[PDB]
Structure formats: C-alpha cells, structure tokens
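Repro case for the chain-ordering regression, as requested:
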Amino acid sequence: MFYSLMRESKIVIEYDGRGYHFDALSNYDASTSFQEFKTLRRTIHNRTNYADSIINAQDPSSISLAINFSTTLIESNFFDWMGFTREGNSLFLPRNTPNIEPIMFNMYIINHNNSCIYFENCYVSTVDFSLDKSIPILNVGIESGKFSEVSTFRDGYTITQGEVLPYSAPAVYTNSSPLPALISASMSFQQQCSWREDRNIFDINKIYTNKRAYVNEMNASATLAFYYVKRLVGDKFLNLDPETRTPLIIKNKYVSITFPLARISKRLNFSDLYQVEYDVIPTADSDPVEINFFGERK
Amino acid sequence: VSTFRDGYTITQGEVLPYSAPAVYTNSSPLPALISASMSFQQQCSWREDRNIFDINKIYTNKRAYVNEMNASATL
Amino acid sequence: MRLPDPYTNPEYPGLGFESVNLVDNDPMIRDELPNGKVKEVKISAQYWGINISYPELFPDEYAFLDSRLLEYKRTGDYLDVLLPQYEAFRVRGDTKSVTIPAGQKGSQIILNTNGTLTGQPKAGDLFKLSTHPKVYKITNFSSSGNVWNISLYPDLFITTTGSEKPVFNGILFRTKLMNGDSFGSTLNNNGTYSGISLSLRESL
Amino acid sequence: STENRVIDLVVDENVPYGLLMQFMDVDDSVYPSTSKPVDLTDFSLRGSIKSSLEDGAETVASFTTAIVDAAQGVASISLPVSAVTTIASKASKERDRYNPRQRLAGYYDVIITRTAVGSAASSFRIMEGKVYISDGVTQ
Amino acid sequence: MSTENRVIDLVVDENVPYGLLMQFMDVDDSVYPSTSKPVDLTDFSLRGSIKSSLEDGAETVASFTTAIVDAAQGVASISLPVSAVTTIASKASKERDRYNPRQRLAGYYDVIITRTAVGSAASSFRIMEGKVYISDGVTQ
Amino acid sequence: STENRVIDLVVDENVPYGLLMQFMDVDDSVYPSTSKPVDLTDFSLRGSIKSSLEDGAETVASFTTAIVDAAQGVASISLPVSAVTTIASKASKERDRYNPRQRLAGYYDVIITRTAVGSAASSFRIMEGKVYISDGVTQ
Amino acid sequence: MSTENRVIDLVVDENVPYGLLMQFMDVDDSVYPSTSKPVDLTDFSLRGSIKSSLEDGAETVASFTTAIVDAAQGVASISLPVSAVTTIASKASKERDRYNPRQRLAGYYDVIITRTAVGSAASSFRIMEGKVYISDGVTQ
Amino acid sequence: MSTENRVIDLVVDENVPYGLLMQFMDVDDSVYPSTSKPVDLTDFSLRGSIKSSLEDGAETVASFTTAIVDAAQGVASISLPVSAVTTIASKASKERDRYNPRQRLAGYYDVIITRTAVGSAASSFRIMEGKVYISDGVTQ
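-- result from build under test --
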C-alpha cells in the first residue's frame, strides 16, 4: 500500500483563495490528536475497573515550519498574516494590534496518491530567525483548530519560493556606528493569541473543534550576543550600563530589522572568552519596528 | 536475615523463542505494525497509620488499599 | 418506594453511592454540672441520617433517577434505600419460623431460631423488625445453642408482641428527602450531571 | 465500528459444525444504542467454500443455510460432518503460525438476499474470511 | 472556502450488484442559517465509464448504467448490474495485496452530469473521479 | 471448538487420574451470578490420546469417561492407573532442563454428544491440548 | 498453577531425626472468604519415598515413615529416623549450594495419600513433590 | 509466615570466658494478643561441637559445655571455659584480615536441644548453626 514520506510532500497555505506553495522548506513538524473525557465511576456497589471515555474534541494542532529565505520574498507574507502593516517591501509593527481576532488561513500538507491532511483555522503565532555564521532560516509556528483528511486539495503551481538567498554576514549598528565583535543576532516576533473554547451542551455527542481566537499581544524582540570588548579604560560607549533609548538596527545584505528606539539590557558571562548579551525590545513611544526584505541588489 | 527461602523446584524454564507480534481486528490484520506496548497496573496506596504509640520506634507500612486496576496498550 | 441502585437496575451502573455517610442523630438534654459531672437525658427519638453522593451521571441515568425522585415527591410516600456495605449475607435461612417472645422492651432482645438459621450476626451489622420500620445496629452478640441474645444500640421502639420476625438481610431505611426544596442539577459541556448528592433522613 | 465482515472460521475435524448468527440492528442516535433486531422475511443466505480466489477454483464445500426464529432475527449456518470431512481432505498440509492445529482449507462468504420483497433482488454479502480446519485426535 | 472531495474511490463486490445514489442539494450561507433545498433534476442525465488506465487509448472495462430516482428530492442513482461487475472482475489486475487478498485494482472512473436542451447551454460537469476496486467473492 | 481455550492436562505417574467438568450456562444480564447447571441427561462424552497431531498416529490411551451427576451438570473425564502407566511408557524422553518432571505424551480431545430420540447428532468439541506426564518416584 | 501448587522443598538436617507435621484442612474460598474445616482423615493412608534421580532405574535412598497422629482434625505426620537421615547424607551429592554452603542435593520425593475404604472411592492423589536437600552438621 | 534466623555467627574473646544464654518462649497469635509463656526445660539437654570444616572428617576444635539456668523462666546457657577459648585460639586459622587483625576464623558450630526419656520420643532439633570467630587478645 501507500506509505507517506516526509521528503515526498508539499505544503500549500491557502489564503484569500490563492495557494501559497512554500518551497525551500528545510523541515516541518506537525501532530494531530483528540481530547477525551475519561472518568472512572467506582462506587460502593461496584468498584469498577473500566473507564467511561468519550472523544468529544480535537486538540489544537501545533505546526512548525522551517523556511529558507528566497528571492521572491513569499516568506514575508508570514509577517503580513501575523499582523504587520505593509508599505512596499517593509513590514511595520503597528503601535496597536489592529483587530481582536488574528488572520485565519487554511493549510494543506500534500502527498502522493491524492493523500492530504487539511489544517483549518490556522494563524501564525511565532516567527524567529537567527542571523549568525550559518545560513539564516526563519522558524514559523502556526496553531490549527481543525484537522481533516481530504482527497482533492489546492496546489500552488505558480506562487512558490524562488532560489535561496546567498549567505551574508550580519552586522548590528547604532545609527551608523558598528558594534564590534558580533557572535549571533537572534530576532523573535510573536502574535500570542489564545483559543476561545466555547464547548457547550449543544455539542454533546459531537466532536468539537476550536474556531475563534483573540490576540493577547504582539511584540518584536531580539537577543544579541557579543564578546566583551572595551577600547578605553572607563569607556562610555561600550559598558554594562542599561540604555533606556538608543537607535539600533540588525542589518544584513537582504534583511534589516530596525528599532527606532530600543531598551537594551546587558548580561556578562565570564566564559572562556568574556561574552556580553543584549536584550533589545522597543521602547514605549518608539516608532514602529521595521523589517525590510531585500531580494537582490537591495 | 541470615536464613531464607530458596526456590529449588519452582523456577522459570527456558526463555521462549522470539516471534513477531501481530494485531488483529476480529480476523483482519492491521498493516504496518511497529511496536505494541501493553501496560497493566494495580494502583494501590499505602495507608499510613503512624500514631503516638509508635513514638521512639521505627514504623513500617503494613496495609494498603486498591485505588483502581486497569489494562492499557499503546500501538 | 425503592431508591434506584445498581442492584435494582443493573443497566444503570452510574447509579450507586460514590460515598455514603451514615450519621447517628440522637438528640439529648446534655447538662454540664459545675462539679465536673456531665448529665444527659434521652427524650427525643433517634434517627439514622444518610448522605448519599453520586458519581458522574449520564443524561439517561439522571433521567431515571430524577424521574423516581419526582415520583417520590408526587405520591408523597417514603423512600427506601439499601446500604450495600451492610449487605454481607452473614445469616442464611428463612426467618419465618423464628419466634421472638412477647413483652420485651429496651436494648436487649431474645429470639429463638428453633434450629433454622445458619450464620452468626457479628457486632456492627444491621437489624430490623418485620413490623416496625426502625433500623437498629447490633452492638454485641451471645448465643446459647439456638437462642440468640442480641443487644441493639437504639432501644426497641415498640415492645415485641410475639409475632415480629427478625430481618437480617435486605434491610431498607424508611427515609425522607431533605434536599427537596432546592434541588438543582448542572449539565456540563462534557455531557454528564456532576455533583448529584442526597441528604436523606430516616422518618420514624 | 466501520466494517468487520472479515472473520475467520475454525471448524473441527470429525465434528459437525454449526454457527448461530443473531442478526441485529444497532443505532447510535440515542446514547443507549437501540437493540432492535432485524425481521427475517424473504431472506435466504448462500455460502460456498472455495479454495483460493482465482477464477475456476474448485468448490470445496457449500454451506447449508437455516432460517429459524425470524421474528427475533437469529439464523443458523451449518454443514454436515460429511462436508467437514470433504473440507479436511483438501486442506493444505501447512499449519497456521499461531495454532499448530489449524490448516487453511479455503475461502468463504455468505450473501443475504431479498427475493422480490419489493420487486428487488437486494442481495449483499454479509461476512467473509478464511476457513480453517482444526485437526482432531478422537477419530 | 473549504475544499471539495471530487476524488472518490469505489469498492465493488464480485457477484453482487453495486448501487450508489447521489443527492444534489442547493446550499447557501446568509443571515438566516443554512437553507438547503433539493436540486430539481430535470433534463439532468449522467454517464460514467471505466478504463484500465488514464493514458489515452485505454481499454474500456465497462460503463455504468445511469438513472434518476427522485427529481423532487434531488436524488440520482449511479450503479451497474451484476453482469457488469463480473465483466470488470474478469478485466481486473491479477496482482494481489497481502493483508487483504480480496481487493484488486480495476481501473479509473468518471461521472459527468449534463443538461442538454435547445434552450439549455451545452454544459457538462465532472461531478466525481477516482479509482474502482473489486472485492473478489467465491460464491457464484 | 475453542482454539483460545487450550489447556494442557498433567497426569501424575503411579496415580489414577481424575478431572471433573461443570456444564453450567449463565445469563448475567438480569443480575450478576445468574448461573443454572445444565442438564447432562442423555449426554455421552468421549475422547482419545494420540502420539502425533496427524493422521496415521498411534493411539496412546482413551479416557474412561463417565457422567457423575445427571441433571446436576458435573461430568468427569478420567482414566485408570494402568492407562497412566501406558502413557508413561509411551511418553517421550526429551526432559526439560528446568522442568525435569514433565514429559510430553501426546495430544488429546474429547467430544460431547447428544443421543436423544427426536433429535440428531450434536457432537461438539470441548477440550483440546496436550497431555503431560509428571514423573514419580514413590511408585 | 498446573503443578506449582503442590510442590515444596524439604531440607533434612544431618544428625537429627527429621519430622514434618501436616494439617489437612478443607478451605472454602469460592463460595465465601474465611471458611475452613478439617478433613476427616480416617482411612486416608499416606506413603512416600525418596530417590536419587527421576530415571526409570533409581535408588530408593529412603522412605518416609508416615503416621496419622489424629484420625479427625486432619492432622498427619511424615517423618524419617536418624538412620535414614544418615543414609541420605552419605548418599548425597558433594556439590554444595553457593548461597547456603550447608545444603547439598540428595534427591527427589513424592507423597501419595490413599483413601482406601469400604466405599468404592479408593482414589489416590499426589499431595507433595519437590527436591530433598541435606544440611550438613558438625555436632555429630 | 516470617523467616527464622537459625544461622548465628559467634565471636569469642581470647583469654576470656565466653557465655551465651538462650531463652525458649512459647508464642501464639489469637484473638487476644500475643501470649508468651516460658517453655519449661525439663529433660531438655544441649550439646554443641566445633570443627574446623563442614566436610566429613573435620578436626574437632573443641566442644561447648551445656547447662540449664532456670527451667521456670525457660533459660538455658551455652558457653565454654577460658581454657577452651585458648584451645580454639590455638587451632584457629592464621590468616588475618586487614582493617581488623583481631578476628580469625575458628570453624563451624552446631547446637542440638534434645529430650530423651523412656516415654519421650527420640527427637532432636538443631536450634542454631553458624561459624565461630576469635578476637585475639594480648593480655594473659
């Protein structure tokens, strides 16, 4: 019979009636499960041994995708779907969350012989990538409400990811002054939604699937790792004091995350070679956080 | 203890040869088995009855009651 | 009438006591004398109180249970219950040929089995007379051949008339509900009635 | 639930065989599933035991259908001890893995049928599987 | 917004007539809840064929007999007689599969519902598709 | 028969063997422990022991069957001491390294039968398995 | 529990007359817990023996001198004298138990009870079996 | 149901008399709690011997002197004089053990309590067993 290989698969995200086949996929992980109500009615009459278990709900699925950067920048739609406002090829973090509910979309995981798993009512809840000395890759995390098995599906023949972008060394700046001795710049963006369970007595003897959710908060964060370097005795630029507001940018040849004003906290580790670690979050009144997506030649 | 009980006669014989497992529904085989794990439990609980008459003495649990029995399997 | 339970209706295993509280209720005129002596006078009648707690009840089981309870509330009769922990059939035989000599009042009782019963009722078991619906509790036992001497915790409510027959098995408490005035049942989204409990109370 | 038509029959050597089918109609709309039995009118069962599924396979034996107690739905399928001997004669010499007494004798299936109860020949297969002969010792 | 399931795989039983009936229902999502009315099958005909392969030039194993049961309730039945089942059984692939020797692949099938009239547009519609399998039987 | 209910009999050497059954049908749907002893009137069980599980095997012994209590449901399967001695003589000598008392003698089955006027053959197999001999020294 | 129930081991102590006290009792558990009555052992004779090996040709190293101390109450006693113990110790294997060096293997044993009586119920049962071990001593 | 502890290892002190006393107590478990009454040691004698090895033909190092202290309280004392302690010390193994050069293995010992009379059965009973060690002393 037909076995199902992960390497022989195709992941298509269905949004607005168009299929976004996300090629250049390094690895994805997903699971499906059901919720049970298992009670044991041991009584003084009969100290029974057999439980009363009924399947009544579908446990929400947690799908994680690892997607390489591409020249056609389809992967920026994950920021677009997660709530960021768009102007050109740059994504803004809005001052306030636009809507109460996230942007919902369906997703297919295609396989050979018309086999498919249909995740519905999905939303992008996490996107983080590490700019480092290895090839950058953004791990997106989406949560589903209802999963199903379907025969025919949506396959993104045209909308697809192009060639992976060549590696380019990261560099973090303050205005235009470079920060020396970078190790690993990791950026994190989240849409911490929550499922609104509305399982009621009208759903008795039926399988319940989560359908609606609301956004608790959105945020942009970055953890920067440096080597503890000082150029002067009693230096003022490079030290361990906190910085309430400072313009920061984690720049690459193909992407640049901008914090117009940042709150930096420093942490020193007395390891083999001393390392300082930053904790960059935008300030209260900071302008929207920028995320530029340069395909080629900026 | 110094002397004990040693089961000269009541003993386990030779180990049974390996044989591949198979799970059925009525008589229809279920294809592509990997690992069938069975679990059985008697989830008893100790009834601690340490009282003031056991002061200056070492107490040892003696009695217990069965909370539940069950049979389970993960395929 | 009979309170439904897995013995009468085995098709409903959800019925059946998750926990039963058999309380002793003997009102007494207790007085604490200034000299340290405590004097208590028994005047009001004693009555067993039964607190029954039910496990998760499915809709059909609760439908049967509350149908029976509402029939109770309608026809107004008494509601008999059978505690299962006291259902250890420790006395075989038929008790019709057992005579209890008349003119007996108080805790002690003398009954002649005439060589019919097999099995000894140990202390702590229940006891009930055929005519009166009161339920006693054996506290001590002593037999000399066929004659049995039984001591009961509550004094015999009625003096034996020479025809009352012992009932060592299938003893039912003639109780009345005490939660009737405000008795609500909650239905969960899981589909079960949770926290169903009864506060019964023996009448007479 | 789903489908469980596939069940294997283990018939005994030197002993006549008889199976008792309590036909039933369970419906799970109400939580205590309805125990309504089907009513056996204008019903006939046919079953043959044929070695292998390939076309032209020789007919090892044929089941003998009995319809009794039509009101409550039960029915019986059986075959005489002579049929048992004929089955055991043609059974393969290779024995089953789980039981060293059974030997594969062939395949089978019984087919219910309505004959013009509403001017329709509504015949469908009831069950199926493999027939296993269990070697006896008494005779 | 959800997906359809046009691909359906049928399993027939050898020596037994096969009967499948389809109901077409009109649907809508509005302020009032989902209103469903059966589609009136007038001038609606079906036609289905089975071949052993998708590629052009495939041998036609058999063809399905089409009928309309109830126009008012929008029910159409697509089935084949027992002789057609035997014909398909003869032409099926001889390759068996372990864990269930009964099933064998018979080929691919399609169903088109069409409405042909002078005033009606020449419109066809492939309602389903998939593969046809056979559950080999020993009786008969 | 009962393929899942195979039980191996153990017969002691130098000791007459005795095994008793109880045919007692149950129906616990009304209430648990509702069991009625089956009437065994005009029932006659019989069995045999053979060295190998195939045709042409040499018979080892035949159980001396009986019906201890008619209408009470207590049947008995047994054989005298001389038959046990014959079994011990015929039994194999491949003694186990950790069960040096048990040797395999053969395979056994017994069939219950109805011989009622106004009825037909009702043979049915109720026991199945192997006969193990336990060695003895006290004679 | 085919044979696991009626098997126990005996360790006769060297230079001491070995006597084992048995108490038959008819325990009823299926009908109701905690109900037991003695077996009326009148006409219930006992006999046992010991042999070095289980082969057909084996040496009768000893034999228990069984006796029914109480006809009722189901009390019996199997015992062997000092000479039999000495014979067993002399005719025992020289290989010592590692977990208890004083014990060495002597042989196998069985016990049969024969309830011969006027009633035609002359049944026999093997109520005991196992291995016989000798525990060495120095007090002589 | 619990186990006994017949195996007891004794440690004597060189140049010092060794005295061990045993009390035999009747016990029972009944409705009333454990009732213990001392066993009356009448016609009860003890006898113990020590050899350097378990195997037959072992050299007898010494023998214990036996006495009964109180029959009513069921107390019997088993001991040896200082000269016997010296005799055993001379015959002990010369192999020392580090972390405690004092102790040396002397041999194995057994104790049998017996009751011999015309009306009494010829019954012996090995009450204990084990090994005898010596704590070498320098004084005397």
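Ordering looks correct now. The first strand of chain D starts at residue 9 and ends at 12.
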